[PDB]
Structures are given as structure tokens and as C-alpha cells.
Design a protein around this ligand. Structure first.
Ligand code: HEM
Ligand SMILES: CCCc1ccc(C(=O)O)cc1
Ligand SMILES: [Cl-]
Length: 393
């Protein structure tokens, strides 16, 4: 009944070009079995959306990577939000939602926007740049560590730590084992910065610690919730902004439309999230026997959701393989869906919008002018290097 496939969705060949294999995964059936890793897979929009929206059957507290926390020790103490189910999930979720609130966005927007304009002006003086190191990495590093309230020293640990986190969701392949081999210093830095005295007043980290007296979280929960933001809050935005720049570089007609109406910036970024899906995959674990698209999945099974494939499923999207900055993007699953849907999405969208606005107003052309290099990670999709020439408007 369930087709068995040998595709390794965590192989370098797959990362290098996932799209043919994602169509094979979709077209084989609504539910497949991946013999390489002994997990169920769902690659169509409908089943990805259904699974994400049934957290009782498809739980998160046994891990959202391959490893099952009922069978193996997690590589670090479980996240109190990502790797929790309701009800334990609910109040930590509420705290992070208030920390990363509309009011907070109002407080940081003008500085995020000025930082975005400044970086584009700086890049335009250089002309030829690497849109990864010099833009997609450099811009989030100039606003996000400061918005967290982190000291200057040790920030070189943040992207290595995030890479480790996202590799650690994957199977025990060489990418994961090498990441864990190298983890100790990045882990030590990140855990230390989560302590209340290390987080500058008015920042995200200080605000989490200040929320430890409401009956929602206790003081000993606040360090791990800071850890969540230092895990999920930087590398994702690097790859999201990198996706959007890569899209604009590959689709000049869409850069030209965005220049003509910079208010399209927010949707141009949302579409880049759908088109490249920086977070490619998430797992769940079944808490009971369940029917899903005609397959009977037993209890205690890992299920792998292909977010990138769901976002390119022709059953749900017209011309899914086109980048369209006026597409109605509502409903894509690049930020997830349901109770765990990205609690940091307002920060991500704010960074993406003000960077795309800056490019829309200041840049006339983005031309790839050098070898493109992909970056390989078990969970994140994005580039290592993207040489572009920027032409001023
Ligand atoms: C383009 C940028 C980003 C993308 C594509 C992205 C993607 C995702 C996805 C797919 C999930 C759902 C995981 C699941 O269902 O198991 C998620 C959750 C989460 N994200 Fe984001 N994320 C981004 C940016 C951020 C930022 C900027 C922050 C914090 C400042 C953040 C913090 C979190 C947290 C804490 C969760 C856990 C939420 C929960 O379990 O309730 N993310 N993200
Ligand atoms: C898997 C989605 C991205 C993500 C990564 C880590 C965390 C966390 O450490 O809580 C939350 C979300
Ligand atoms: Cl850790």
C-alpha cells in the first residue's frame, strides 16, 4: 500500500538539486516510506498541512528531528517550545509571542530599516560583493545580536551554533556527526549568554527574563527560551534574505517590478520564503495508530514533512517553480502551520521587508558575476557564496 523509496533526502546530491526527487516523492503517493532512514514521508501540500495541524497525533515532544527522544538522549536539553506539546507548550509560546510582539516590532523597526539602508549604501560603494557574507549574513548580524542584548565578544559563535542545531535535526550522517564533534565551544558560549546578567536591558533576552513572574514561565525556564532565539533567530533569516537576493538575481523582471513599487517588498520576501523554503524539513512522532492519506501509520513512528516540496506542490500552487512577487503567498508552510508556526515570523518578515525595500529603492540591477556555491545542511537550504555586481539606481 505505502510505496517504499530509496531516496535519501539528507544526501548531498539531494541538497544540490532537490526538485526532481521532491516530485518523485509527491507523485509516488500521499504517504511514502523512506527505507534509508525508516521514516514515513509526506511531500504534498495537503498532507504536510494536515500533519502540522494535528499536534495531538503528530507530536513534537519526542523531537522534531530524526532522533526519537523516547529512544535516544537528545543532544542538548529539549527546547521548551519547539520540542514541547500542548499544554506544556502553551505558556512558553505565549511569552515568546509577547516578547516578539507587534509593540516590540514598532520599537525596533526604524533602527532595523536604517541598518538595512546603510548596508546597501555600503555595498554600492564596493560594486562587486558576495551577497551571502556581505549581505545575507552581514545584515542580520548587524541588527539581531544587538536586538537580543548580546555583548560584542563571542558573536562569532552564533552562526556555527545555529548550523549545528539544524544539522542535529537530521539523521546521524557525516554532516550531523561532524557538527556535534565541533559543538562544545559554541554550546558553551550560547548557554552562558542565556543567563540574565549577560543580556542587555531592553533586549529580547532581558524581556524573556522579565516575564518570569507572571505565572507563565519560571526563572529557570528563561535561559532555555533565550536559547531558542539564539538557535532559530539568526541563521534562518540569513538564508531567507539570501533566498530573496538569489531570486531577484535570477529573475530580473521581478527586481524590475519591485523597484517600480517598493511596497511589494514584504510579499517579495514572503514569496522567497515559499520559493526556497530555508527550513526544508521538520519531523513529528505519531502518538497512536493513525490513518493519513490512506496509510495506516502505527504508534511511535517518525514522520518527515517536506516543507519545501509542499511549497512547490502543483496541486496547491499555480506555476510553483516561478518566483512571483505578487503571488498570493498566504498558506505557504515555510514558517510552519498551526500551534508551532514560527513565533519569530514578525522579526523575520521585518528584516526581509526592510532589506528588500532598501534594494528596491537603491539598486538598479543585481547580476551574478562569479561562481555560485551552495551550503549543505541537513535542515537548512541556502548558499555559501553568491557573487553579484550591484548597479546603483
Ligand atoms: C525566514 C526565517 C525563518 C524561517 C523560514 C523559520 C521557520 C520556522 C518553522 C518552519 C518553524 C516551525 C517548526 C515546527 O513546526 O516544528 C519555526 C518555529 C520557530 N521559530 Fe522560526 N523561522 C524563521 C525565523 C525565526 C526567527 C527570526 C526567530 C526568532 C527571533 C524564530 C524562532 C522560532 C521559534 C522559537 C520557533 C518555535 C515555535 C514553536 O515551537 O511554537 N524563527 N520557524
Ligand atoms: C525547527 C524550526 C527552527 C527552530 C530551531 C530551534 C528552535 C529552538 O531551539 O527552540 C526553534 C525553532
Ligand atoms: Cl546547546
Amino acid at each position: 500500500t505505502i510505496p517504499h523509496l530509496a531516496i535519501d533526502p539528507f544526501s548531498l546530491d539531494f541538497f544540490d538539486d532537490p526538485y526532481p526527487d521532491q516530485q518523485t516523492l509527491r507523485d509516488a503517493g500521499p504517504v511514502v516510506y523512506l527505507d534509508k532512514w525508516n521514516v514515513y514521508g509526506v511531500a504534498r501540500y495537503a498532507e504536510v498541512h494536515a500533519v502540522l495541524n494535528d499536534p495531538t497525533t503528530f507530536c513534537s515532544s519526542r523531537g522534531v528531528g530524526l532522533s526519537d527522544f523516547k529512544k535516544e538522549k537528545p543532544w542538548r536539553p529539549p527546547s521548551l517550545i519547539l520540542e514541547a506539546d500542548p499544554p506544556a507548550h502553551t505558556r512558553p509560546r505565549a511569552v515568546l509571542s509577547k516578547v516578539l510582539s507587534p509593540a516590540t516590532m514598532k520599537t525596533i523597526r526604524d533602527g532595523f530599516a536604517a541598518a538595512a539602508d546603510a548596508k546597501v549604501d555600503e555595498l554600492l560603494q564596493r560594486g562587486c560583493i558576495d551577497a551571502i557574507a556581505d549581505l545575507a549574513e552581514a545584515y542580520p548580524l548587524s541588527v539581531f545580536p544587538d536586538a537580543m542584548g548580546l555583548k560584542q565578544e563571542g558573536r562569532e559563535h552564533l552562526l556555527p551554533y545555529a548550523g549545528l542545531v539544524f544539522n542535529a535535526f537530521g539523521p546521524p550522517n557525516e554532516l550531523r556527526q561532524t557538527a556535534i564533534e565541533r559543538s562544545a565551544p559554541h554550546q558553551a558560549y550560547v548557554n552562558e549568554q542565556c543567563q540574565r546578567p549577560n543580556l542587555a536591558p531592553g533586549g529580547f533576552g532581558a524581556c524573556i527574563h522579565a516575564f518570569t513572574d507572571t505565572g507563565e514561565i519560571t526563572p529557570d525556564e528563561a535561559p532555555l527560551l533565550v536559547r531558542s532565539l539564539l538557535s532559530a533567530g539568526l541563521d534562518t533569516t540569513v538564508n531567507g534574505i539570501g533566498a530573496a537576493v538569489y531570486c531577484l538575481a535570477r529573475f530580473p523582471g521581478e527586481l524590475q517590478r519591485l523597484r517600480s513599487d517598493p511596497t511589494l517588498a514584504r510579499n517579495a520576501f514572503e514569496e522567497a520564503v515559499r520559493f526556497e523554503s530555508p527550513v526544508q524539513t521538520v519531523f513529528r512522532t505519531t502518538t497512536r495508530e493513525v490513518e493519513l492519506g490512506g496509510a495506516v501509520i502505527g504508534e511511535g513512528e517518525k514522520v518527515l514533512m517536506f516543507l519545501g516540496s509542499a511549497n512547490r506542490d502543483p496541486r496547491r500552487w499555480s506555476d510553483p517553480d516561478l518566483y512571483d512577487i505578487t503571488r498570493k503567498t498566504s498558506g505557504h508552510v515555510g514558517f510552519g502551520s498551526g500551534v508551532h508556526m514560527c513565533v519569530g515570523q514578525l522579526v523575520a518578515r521585518l528584516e526581509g521587508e526592510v532589506m528588500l525595500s532598501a534594494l528596491a529603492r537603491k539598486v538598479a540591477a543585481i547580476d551574478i558575476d562569479g561562481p555560485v556555491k551552495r551550503r549543505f545542511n541537513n535542515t537548512l537550504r541556502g548558499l555559501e557564496s553568491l557573487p553579484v555586481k550591484l548597479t546603483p539606481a
